[PDB]
């Protein structure tokens, strides 16, 4: 709207998609989050070719400061660029819309839960490897994801895994797994959170590593829910007692060791994503398919 700083407006120019270049099919919803519903759309680029996109309508913006923060991040997130991270194609201002590349196979969790598919143990470990490669990138940019999970990674038509659900695309795409803190009101995916994050609400790249370990366990169970018989808030106690996710039936031992390392109670003794890329590449390499 009109109250926006013009210099900020000028700084975001290169992110902004104009209505003439974007066709959104608003009659069908393909995805839903908290902050908006998601629709298929086509983006006319330089050449006049249709880029297939997922377009999100941000429904809960109430004031102009929220919009400015939204543009400010748009500018940051547009510079991010890795094969295993979901890119931002841009934003439509003229509801604001977030334009993302369309991901043919949807979120990684629904993909592996879908019983018509048979991803092998090698394929599953490959998906995890790809996640670690994108997280390696993000961490190199000293960006903390805070909500890494298989529901928040996407899969494209070539089965490239894209880490998603951060920046302008950040949402709860499955609200079942988020709780509210008694004394701060933040929305917490508790069963993916590191011990320290549950105790002191502090997030770091090493707490991204904890979540990555839970994500690997998701892969090895083909998307079973973690701690099914541990209630949301009994989880801190469960972990503080020195207990962890059990090894999945078809999880190879060396990968379970990787997981367990990811959940070390000392953030600093957890491996880095660069070490996870190395070690998981090795594990992936020892399978046939
Ligand atoms: N729902 C879809 O078919 C679809 C296809 N492609 C994309 C690309 C992004 N989304 S999303 O926003 O809805 C989404 C959906 C679930 C998890 C995360 C994300 N994310 O991009 O952050 C997509 C959704």
From Swiss-Prot:
Expressed in normal hepatocytes as well as in epithelial cells lining the stomach, the small and the large intestine. Found also in basal keratinocytes of esophagus and skin. High levels are found in liver, gastrointestinal tract, thyroid and kidney. Also present in the brain. Expressed in metaphyseal bone (at protein level). Residues 263-289 are annotated as: Interaction with MUC20. Changing residue 171 to N: In RCCP; germline mutation. Residues 155-289 are annotated as: Interaction with RANBP9. The kinase domain is involved in SPSB1 binding. The beta-propeller Sema domain mediates binding to HGF. It is linked to Activation of MET after rearrangement with the TPR gene produces an oncogenic protein. This is Hepatocyte growth factor receptor. It comes from Homo sapiens.
């Amino acid at each position: 709207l009109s109250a926006l700083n013009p210099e900020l407006v000028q700084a975001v120019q290169h992110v902004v998609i104009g209505p003439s270049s974007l066709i959104v099919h608003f009659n069908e919803v393909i995805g839903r989050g908290h902050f908006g519903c998601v629709y298929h759309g086509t983006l006319l680029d330089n050449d006049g070719k249709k880029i297939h996109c997922a377009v999100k309508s941000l429904n809960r913006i109430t004031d102009i400061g929220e919009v400015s923060q939204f543009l400010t991040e748009g500018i940051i997130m547009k510079d991010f660029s890795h094969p295993n991270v979901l890119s931002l194609l841009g934003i439509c201002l003229r509801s604001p819309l977030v334009v993302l590349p369309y991901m043919k196979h949807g979120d990684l969790r629904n993909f592996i839960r879908n019983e018509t598919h048979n991803p092998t143990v090698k394929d599953l470990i490959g998906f995890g490897l790809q996640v670690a490669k994108g997280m390696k990138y993000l961490a190199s940019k000293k960006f903390v994801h805070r909500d890494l999970a298989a529901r928040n990674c996407m899969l494209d038509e070539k089965f490239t895994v894209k880490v998603a659900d951060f920046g302008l695309a950040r949402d709860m795409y499955d609200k079942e797994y988020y709780s509210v803190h008694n004394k701060t009101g933040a929305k917490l995916p508790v069963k993916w959170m590191a011990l320290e994050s549950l105790q002191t609400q502090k997030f770091t790249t090493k707490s991204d590593v904890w979540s990555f370990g839970v994500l690997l366990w998701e892969l090895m169970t083909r998307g079973a829910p973690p701690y099914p018989d541990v209630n949301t808030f009994d989880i801190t106690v469960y972990l503080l007692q020195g207990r962890r996710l059990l090894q999945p039936e078809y999880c190879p031992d060396p990968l379970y060791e990787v997981m367990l390392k990811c959940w070390h109670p000392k953030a600093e003794m957890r491996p880095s994503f660069s070490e996870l890329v190395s070690r998981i590449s090795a594990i992936f390499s020892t399978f046939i398919g």
